[PDB]
Amino acid sequence: ALPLYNQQVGDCCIIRVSLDVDNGNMYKSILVTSQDKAPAVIRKAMDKHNLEEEEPEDYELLQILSDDRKLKIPENANVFYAMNSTANYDFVLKKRT
């Protein structure tokens, strides 16, 4: 039907979440929407990281990029998508500890 992720332009995106606080879990990819928000980020991330890491209102949204080496946004990571979406999508899901 279609090839691997090459040219994706519409009302969605991709994400690569990673937990590093109270639960040392491996990297996990999460789907992104056009109007994605903090609650959705942690929610979708928790679904993929369903290993003692299921707390929507208990995590922080960080990201590792080229121009933005490493950024960290609080629970209100609604604008996180408008900042982290520059090149890479390696975001860190840190629990509130």
Domain boundaries, the chain: 1-97
CA distances from 81 to 4, 11, 42, 44, 73 (A): 23, 13, 13, 14, 10
1-97 under CATH 3.10.20.90, yes or no: yes
Experimental method: NMR
Q: Sheet with 28-33: list strands edge to edge.
A: 28-33, 12-18, 90-95, 59-64, 70-73
Give residue 95's identity as a one-letter amino acid code.
K
Tell me how many degrees the CA angle 46-11-58 measures, rounded to the nearest 5: 20
Both tokens assigned to 14: 């991709």
